[PDB]
Amino acid sequence: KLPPGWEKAMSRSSGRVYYFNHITNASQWERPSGEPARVRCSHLLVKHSQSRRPSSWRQEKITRTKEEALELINGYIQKIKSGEEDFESLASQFSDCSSAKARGDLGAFSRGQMQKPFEDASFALRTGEMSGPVFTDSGIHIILRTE
């Protein structure tokens, strides 16, 4: 029916159908459009106190809870989707990954290199597409597939 990971859902607040991807946690009103050796992705990471290292260039000791990290991620996604902020700008300012200094760009990678939920979401995104919150042992990610 739909591309890998996508399913129909019902808006609780509006009653309109929408589409949700259970690999990428992307959600959108529009029906999804229409695998490679490598993809290229950027990401914005928000770490939390349960991260496998709760420390970053932004903060020596990351103390925010997982729930607080998710609320930050949710807010960044809202600003990206509304156009108020660009993904690259938010990643440079707020990603707890050292790749923040490269606007979140991780370069290209194959399957079997990244943490699995990140890999699966990255490969389920089409070029240009953005994930919803993706959970790994590092923290919570917004992933943007660029190639």
Ligand SMILES: Cc1csc(C(N)=O)c1
């Ligand atoms: C909403 C929510 C996200 S993480 C979380 C928890 N209890 O760790 C709750």
Ligand SMILES: Cc1csc(C(N)=O)c1
């Ligand atoms: C992919 C990447 C670019 S900068 C960086 C770092 N400095 O750790 C990671």
